[PDB]
Design a protein around this ligand. Sequence first.
Ligand code: 3PE
Ligand code: 3PE
Ligand code: LMT
Ligand code: LMT
Ligand code: LMT
Ligand code: GTP
Ligand code: I49
Ligand code: MG
Lengths: 347, 51, 320, 98, 140, 112, 174, 95, 115, 47
Amino acid sequence: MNPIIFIIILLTIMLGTIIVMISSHWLLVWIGFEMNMLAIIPIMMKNHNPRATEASTKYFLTQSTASMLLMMAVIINLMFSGQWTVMKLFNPMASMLMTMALAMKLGMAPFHFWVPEVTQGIPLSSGLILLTWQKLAPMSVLYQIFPSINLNLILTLSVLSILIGGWGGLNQTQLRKIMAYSSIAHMGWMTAVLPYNPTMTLLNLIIYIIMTSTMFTMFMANSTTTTLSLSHTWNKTPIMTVLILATLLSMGGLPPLSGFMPKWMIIQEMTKNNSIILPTFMAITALLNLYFYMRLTYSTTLTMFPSTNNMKMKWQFPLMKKMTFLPTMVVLSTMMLPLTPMLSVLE
Amino acid sequence: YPTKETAHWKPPPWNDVDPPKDTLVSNLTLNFGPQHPAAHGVLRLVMELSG
Amino acid sequence: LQYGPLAYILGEKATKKMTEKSKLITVDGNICSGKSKLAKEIAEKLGLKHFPEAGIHYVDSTTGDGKPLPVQFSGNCSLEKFYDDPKSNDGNSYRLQAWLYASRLLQYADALEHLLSTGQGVVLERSIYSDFVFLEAMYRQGFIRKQCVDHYNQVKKVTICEYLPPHVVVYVDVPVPEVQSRIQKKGNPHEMKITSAYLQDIENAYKGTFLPEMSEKCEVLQYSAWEAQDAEKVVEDIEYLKYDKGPWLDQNDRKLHKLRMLVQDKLEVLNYTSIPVFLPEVTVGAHQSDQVFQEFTELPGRKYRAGYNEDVGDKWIWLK
Amino acid sequence: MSMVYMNIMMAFTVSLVGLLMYRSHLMSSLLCLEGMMLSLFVMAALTILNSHFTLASMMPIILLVFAACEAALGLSLLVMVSNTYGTDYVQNLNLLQC
Amino acid sequence: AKTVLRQYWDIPEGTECHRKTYATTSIGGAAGLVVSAYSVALKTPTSFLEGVARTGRYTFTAAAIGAIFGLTSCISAQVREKPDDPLNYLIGGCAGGLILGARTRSYGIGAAACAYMGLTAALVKMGQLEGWQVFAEPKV
Amino acid sequence: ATFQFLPDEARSLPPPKLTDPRLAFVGFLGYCSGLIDNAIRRRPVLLAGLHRQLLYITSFVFVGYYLLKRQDYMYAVRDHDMFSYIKSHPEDFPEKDKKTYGEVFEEFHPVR
Amino acid sequence: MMLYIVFILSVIFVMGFVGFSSKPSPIYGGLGLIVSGGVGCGIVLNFGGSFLGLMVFLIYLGGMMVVFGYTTAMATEQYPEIWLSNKAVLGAFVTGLLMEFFMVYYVLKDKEVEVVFEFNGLGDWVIYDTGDSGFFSEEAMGIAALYSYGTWLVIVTGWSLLIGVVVIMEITRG
Amino acid sequence: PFFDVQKRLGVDLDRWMTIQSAEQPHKIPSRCHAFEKEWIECAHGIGSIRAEKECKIEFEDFRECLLRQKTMKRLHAIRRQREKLIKEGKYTPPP
Amino acid sequence: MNLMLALLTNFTLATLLVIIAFWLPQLNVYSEKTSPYECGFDPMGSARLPFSMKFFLVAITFLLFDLEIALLLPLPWASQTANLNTMLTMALFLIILLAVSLAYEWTQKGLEWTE
Amino acid sequence: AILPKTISLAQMKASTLVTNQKGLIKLYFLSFLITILISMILFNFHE
Ligand SMILES: CCCCCCCCCCCCCCCCCC(=O)OC[C@H](COP(=O)(O)OCCN)OC(=O)CCCCCCCCCCCCCCCCC
Ligand SMILES: CCCCCCCCCCCCCCCCCC(=O)OC[C@H](COP(=O)(O)OCCN)OC(=O)CCCCCCCCCCCCCCCCC
Ligand SMILES: CCCCCCCCCCCCO[C@@H]1O[C@H](CO)[C@@H](O[C@H]2O[C@H](CO)[C@@H](O)[C@H](O)[C@H]2O)[C@H](O)[C@H]1O
Ligand SMILES: CCCCCCCCCCCCO[C@@H]1O[C@H](CO)[C@@H](O[C@H]2O[C@H](CO)[C@@H](O)[C@H](O)[C@H]2O)[C@H](O)[C@H]1O
Ligand SMILES: CCCCCCCCCCCCO[C@@H]1O[C@H](CO)[C@@H](O[C@H]2O[C@H](CO)[C@@H](O)[C@H](O)[C@H]2O)[C@H](O)[C@H]1O
Ligand SMILES: Nc1nc2c(ncn2[C@@H]2O[C@H](COP(=O)(O)OP(=O)(O)OP(=O)(O)O)[C@@H](O)[C@H]2O)c(=O)[nH]1
Ligand SMILES: N=C(N)NC(=N)NCCc1ccc(I)c(Cl)c1
Ligand SMILES: [Mg+2]
C-alpha cells in the first residue's frame, strides 16, 4: 500500500464515522456505516495472507448483514412515521431490528462470534482501530435512540456480553483474542447503563478506548502477539512491563486506578433506579475479566520467564516504534480517579 | 484448558502466514482442430488454456 | 528527517538512487576457499561496500563504540569450543549456529539498507541464504539434534521470506583435499581438528541445495581455485551479466519502501530470532538472563540510548 | 397495511433466511445480499411514491449506489478467497478457530 | 415466556400443585429446547438421529427439573401451610439439582446443583415477595 | 447552546483559580507523562529533554484548565435547573413541620 | 384480476426470491434474481416511478452479468445444482413456495390476512391518490433534485465510489 | 445528531430531506402534508415524553393518513357486507 | 395493457416457432449425434470446470461505473432547476471524480489483464 | 460448595463451552437465525 493511499483510506474510515455522528437523517447514518465498512476492509487485508483474507470476509459478511437490518428498520420507521429524523423510532419492530443491527456491529453476544476471529486475523494496528474507533459510530446511534429501545432486549445483550466475554477470555493465550473477549465484556457495561444514564455510557466508552489503545500500543511496541512472546519483555524493556501491569490492573477495575471509575459510576446510576441485583451480578461476573488479566501480569511483570540466547542481540538496539501518545495514554489509564467529577463535561 | 474437541488445534504461525495451498489450479484443455476453420482441417492442436 | 512514509512521500524513492551498479553480491565457498580475499578485491574494483563475514561479534561492531564485547554478552558461544568438542553437553554447537544466523540476518538487513538508501552495491561473504550448509554439516555429523534443525527451519522460514536474494552469487569451488591442506597452512590449532566428512557435508550442501536453488533466482558464477585468484577476471564476468531473472525485476518503489522500513528497524529484523521455543541449547534461565542483562547496562555507553550517555561524553542531554 | 407490503416484507425475510443459512458457495450467499437490497429498494420506493414525498424519490437511487459498492467489495474478497483455495467454499474459511 | 411465568405467578402458592408442574415443566422444557437449538446449530451432530437424540436429552432433562421443582415446592407449601416461605423454593430448587446430578450421573454436580439451584430459587421467591427488580424500569 | 464546549452564560461564573488543586494535579499528571516518555525511550528520566518535559506540564495544564471550567459550568447548570424546578412545582416539594425529638416517638432496642 | 396486477407481480417477486434464496448453482440463483428484478421493476412502475423501476432493473442486469462471469470462474463445479438436484435445495424451495401459497390463498379468500401482522387484501389500488393533474412527473422532479438540494449526498456518494475503485485494487492485489 | 455541527455552523447537510412537509421542488405537496404539519407543530419544543401523551390526537390522525388502516377496515366491512346482501337478493347497486 | 399484450405476443410467437421447430422435423437421435462438439475428438474434461477471468478487476469496476450512469441519467431533468449554479458544479464534480477513478485505475494498471 | 475448587471448575467448564467452536461462518450465522427467532417467538422483544 502506498503511503498516500493508506492515509486517504484511514481518513475515509474516520469520515464515515463522523458522518454517522453528525447526521440528522437516517439515510446519511446508513451511508456513514457503508463508507466506514468500505474503507476498513483494505486495512484488514493489508498484509495479504490467508488469515487476513478470512478475517476480512467474516467481517464483511457480519457488517453487511447488520447494515441490511439497519436499513430495514429505517424503512419501517419511515412507513410508520413518514420521516427520516435520527431519534426515537416509531415502531417496536423497527427498534428491535435496529437494536440487533447495532449489537452485531458492536460484536455483542450472542452476535459476538466474529470479534475474536477477526481480531486474531488482522495486524495489531488494525485490531486497534477495530476494537476502539469502530465502537464510536454504533454507540452514537444507540445514544440517540435509547428511549425506544426495548429494556429486556438491551439488558439481556448486556448480561450475555459480560458472561461470554468473561468466560471466553479464560481459555485464551493469544493477546489479540484476549483483547477481543475483553472488548465484548466491556461493551456489556456500556449498554447496561444506557437505559438509565447515557452519560455513563460515554464515560465507559471513553475510558475503555484509552486503556485499550494503551495495551495495543504496548503490544505493538515490542511486536508481541502471544502470552509467551510478551513474557520476554522483562528481559528487553523492564519499564514496559510495569506499564502493562498498571494498565492491566486498571482494565480489571481495581481502585485506585482509572478503570474503576466506569464500574463505580455505572453501579451508582443503576442503584438510583432500584437496580441492585443486576449491578451486583455484573460486578461479580467482571471478576472473570480480572482473573485472565492477572495471568498476563504474572507471566509479564510479577515473575521472570525463561528467555532465549538470541535475546541478547536485542539489548544493543533501541526501541524504534513510534509509540504515539503512549506516555499520555498510560497516565490517563491509571491516575484519573481523583478527577472523576470531571465526568460532567460529557453531560 | 485442553479438551477432546480442541485436541487437534495448533498454535498459529509465528508471523501469521499459513503456507500456500495447491488445491488444483488446473488449466483448461481444448481440441483446437482438426475440424476447425483455422486448423487447416487436419491439425489437432491440443491447447492448455488459462482463460 | 529519519526515513519513513513522510520522507518517501516527499521524493525519497529507491529508484532514484539505484543504478546499473546498485547490486548485492555474495561470495560463498567452503572453509579456506579464498572467499575473503576474493570478496575484498571484488568490492574495491567495482567500488562497492565490503561487509566482512559476520562473526560472533558482528553485532558489537555496529553498536556502541564498535569494539567486541565480552563473550558472556553473546551467550558464551565460541567457534573454538565447537571444534574442540562439537558434541558438547552444554549445547554450544547449536547456540553458535543460532547466534550466527541472527548475526547474518542482521548483516543482510544492514547491507540492504545501505543499498537502498545510498544506491551503492555491497559485497558479502556468505549470507542467510547459504548459512544452512553449516547446519546440515553439523547434523550429519551428529553435532546437533533433530529438534535444533526443526527450530532453525522455524526461524529461517519467518525471517528469510521478507528479503530479496542477492543479484549475484559468486561461488568458489575448492575440493575437500585441498581444503584440508589449506587449513594446516593456516596454523590455527582448533581448525585443524576439522574432519573431512564435516567439510564434505558442507560441500554437498552447497552443491546439493544452495547452488541449484540460487540458480533459479540469481546469477551464479562458479570459479575454481585458480580461477578465483585473478579478481580482475572475476569482475570482468560480473560487469557483463544480463540480469534477467529473480525477484528484483518485480520491485517497484512501493515495495522497496516497505522493504526499507523493515531493514532500518533492527528490532523488527530480529523479532523472530527469539521465538519462545524452549530448546535446551538456546534457553536461558531467569536468573542467568537477569544477571547478565544487569551487567550489560553497566558497560560504557550502554545504559541509555545512544546520544544520552554522558559517561562517554554526550552533551546537551537536558535539551535532547 | 396493503397486501403488496405482505409480499415485499416476505421477500426480505426470505432473503435474510437465505443469507443466514449458508450452504457451500460463498457466491450463493453474496446473491442473497443483493436480493435483500432489491427488496429494500422496492419497499422504500413504494412508500415514497405512494406518499408523494418528492425529495425522498432520490434515496432509492442512493440505496442502489451503495449496494454496488457492497457487492463490489464482496466480489473482491471472493476473488481472493478463490485464489487461496481454488474454490469459494465457506468451509475453507475456518483457520481462525485457532 | 411472559404468559407461562404469569400463569405460575398468578395462581396462589401451594394450591393446585398439578397446575404449577405444568407451568414449571413448560419453562423447563422450553429452556431445554433453547439449549438444544444452539447446541445443535453450533455443534453440528454427526447425523439427523444424533441431533434429535441430543435434543431429546436436553429437553427431557430441563423439563424434568422444571416439573420436580414446581411439584416439590408446591407440595411443601400445602404440607407446611406456609405458602409465602422462601424455604419451600429452596427445597424445590434443590430437588431440581439432584435430578440434574442423576441425569448427568455425577454426585459432585448433584451436590453443587442443589446448593446453587436451591439458593437461587429461594432468592427468586424473596424477590417476588419484596418486589426486587432484575431488569428495573428507569425511574431517575 | 448546541455543540458549544463552553456556552456564553458560563462567563458569569468565576473562572477556576490557576492555583486550583485539581489543576495542580493535572500538571502533576503532565509531569508523570514526561518522565514515562523518557523511560520508555531509555533516556535519563529526570534530566533528559527538559524542553519536552515542560511542554507536557503546559499542555496538560492548558487542556485541563478548560475541562475544569466546563466541569464547573455543568454543575452550575444542574443546580440552576434543579432549583428552578423546585420553584415551578411547590406542591411537589412541600415544607413539612419538623417535630422535635421530645415529641417524635422512637422505639428503644436494648442491647442485652 | 387486472386490478390485482401489483399483487400478482409481487407473488412472482417472492417466487424469484425463493428461487435464489434456496441457493442452487449461482447460475440459476442469478436467473431468479433477474426475474425478481423484472417484476420488481413492474411493481415500482405501477406506483408512478418508471425511472426508479427501470433503473433498478438496469442496474441488476449489469450486476448479474458480472456475477455470471465470476460464477464460471470461481463458483462452478462438475454438476451444478438445479432446484431438483439437492434435497436441501428442493426442501427449501418447496417450503418457500408453500408458505407463499398459503399466504396468497388466505389473503385472497378473506380479502385480508394475518401473517404475523395484519395485512389488508382489498387490492393495492385503494390507497392510491385521487388528484393528479400536474404537467410533470413527481418522481423525476424528486430525483432531479439530487443536484440542487442533495449537494451533500452527491459528495458522499461521489467520494465513496472513488474510494471503491481504490479499495478493490488494494484488496485484489497480492 | 450526536454532534450537532449542522446547527452549530448554520449548514444544512441533510435536514432538508428529514420530513415531508419541508420545502419540496416546485412546491409539490406530500399526501399527508397537513397531518404532518399539525403533528409537528403540536409537539415542537416540549419533548417526546410530553408529546407522546399531549400530541396523541395529532399523531393518530397522521398515522391514519400514512397507512390508512382504519379507512381500509371501514371499506372492507362495507364491501363484505354488500356481498353478504347480494346473494340474499337484498340489494341492487345503482346504475 | 398494450405493453403487456405486445410483450406476450412477442414471446408467444418465439415460443411457437420453437415448438414447430421441434415437432415438425423428422428426428433421429443416437448417442454419437448428441455428444458434445469439439472439432471431432472427444472433449478433455468437463466444460463446467473453472474458466479463469483475466479481466476480473475491470468487471468489478464495471459495477461501480455502471452505478455512476444511474446517477448521471437524471441530468437532463436537473438542467431545468432554477438553481443552476449548484447543479452545474455538482454535475461536473461527479463526472470529474468518475474521471479521477478511471485515471487512478489506469495508472495503477488495473485495466491491464492478468497473465 | 463455596469451595474455590468448585467455583473455578465451573468457570473452566463454561469457558470451554463458549470458546470451543469450529470457526465456520455457516454455524455462526445459523445461530444468529436462532437468536432472532426466539427474540420474537419466545420473548416478544419485537413488541
Ligand atoms: C495519583 C493518584 C492515582 C493513584 C493510582 C496509582 C498510580 C500508579 C500509576 C502507575 C503508572 C506507571 C508508572 C510506574 C513507574 C514505575 C517505575 C519503574 O518502572 O521502575 C523502573 C524500572 C525501569 O527499567 P528501565 O527503564 O528499562 O531501566 C533499567 C532499570 N531496570 O523498572 C524496572 O526495572 C522494574 C522491574 C521489576 C518489576 C517490579 C514490578 C513490581 C513493582 C510495580 C510498581 C508499579 C505498580 C503500579 C500499579 C498501581 C500501584 C498502586
Ligand atoms: C510530590 C510527588 C511525589 C511523587 C509521587 C509519585 C507517584 C507515582 C508517579 C508515577 C510516575 C513515576 C515516574 C515514571 C517512571 C519513570 C522512573 C523510572 O522508571 O525509573 C526511575 C528513574 C531512575 O532510573 P533511570 O532509568 O536510571 O533514570 C535516570 C534518572 N535518574 O527515575 C528516578 O530516579 C526517579 C523517578 C521517579 C520514580 C517513580 C517511582 C515509581 C512510582 C510508581 C509506583 C507507584 C506510586 C505510588 C502509588 C501511590 C500513589 C501516590
Ligand atoms: C429479522 C426479520 C425482519 C422481518 C421484518 C418483517 C416486517 C416487519 C413489519 C413491521 C410493522 C408491523 O406492524 C405492527 O402491527 C400493527 C400495525 O398496525 C401494530 O399494532 C399494534 O400497534 C398499533 C398502535 O398504533 C395498533 O394497531 C395496536 O395498538 C397494536 O395492535 C404494531 O404496533 C406494529 O408494530
Ligand atoms: C467463599 C466466598 C469467597 C470465595 C472466593 C474464592 C474465589 C476463587 C479464588 C481462587 C481462584 C484460583 O483459580 C484457580 O483455583 C485452582 C484451585 O482452586 C488452582 O488449581 C490448583 O488446585 C487444583 C485442584 O485443587 C489442582 O488440580 C491444580 O493442579 C492446582 O493448580 C489454580 O491454580 C487457580 O488459579
Ligand atoms: C462469590 C464470588 C466468587 C468469585 C470467583 C471469581 C472467578 C474466578 C474464576 C477462575 C476460573 C479459572 O480457574 C481455573 O480453575 C480450574 C479448576 O480446576 C483450574 O484447573 C485445575 O483443576 C483441573 C481439574 O480440576 C485441572 O484439569 C487443571 O489442570 C488444573 O489447573 C485452572 O487451572 C484454573 O485456571
Ligand atoms: N559452525 C559454523 N562455523 C562457521 C560459520 N561461518 C564461518 N564459520 C567458521 O569460521 C571460520 C572462518 O570462516 P571461513 O571463511 O570459512 O574460513 P577462511 O579461513 O577464512 O577461508 P576464506 O573463505 O578465504 O575466508 C571457519 O572455520 C568456519 O568453519 C557458520 O555459519 N557456522
Ligand atoms: N441520567 C440522565 N438520563 N441524564 C443525565 N445524564 N443527567 C440528568 C440530570 C443531570 C445530571 C447531572 C448534570 I451536571 C446535569 Cl446538567 C443534569
Ligand atoms: Mg573468511
